[PDB]
Every structure is written in structure tokens, then in C-alpha cells.
Amino acid sequence: FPRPRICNLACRAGIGHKYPFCHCR
Structure with a gap:
């Protein structure tokens, strides 16, 4: 799966935990 630009x-903003599809830092 390609890494979404939004992710x-x-x-970077650390809103990864906020965005389900981008459950990043």
C-alpha cells in the first residue's frame, strides 16, 4: 500500500493518532 501524502x-504534526487511516506518531 502506497504511503498517503496526508499520512x-x-x-509531522503528530496528529497520527488523530487520523485513523494515518495512525502515525
């Missing part, structure tokens, strides 16, 4: 932003 990148999410990780």
Missing part, C-alpha cells in the same frame, strides 16, 4: 503531514 506524512499527520506524522
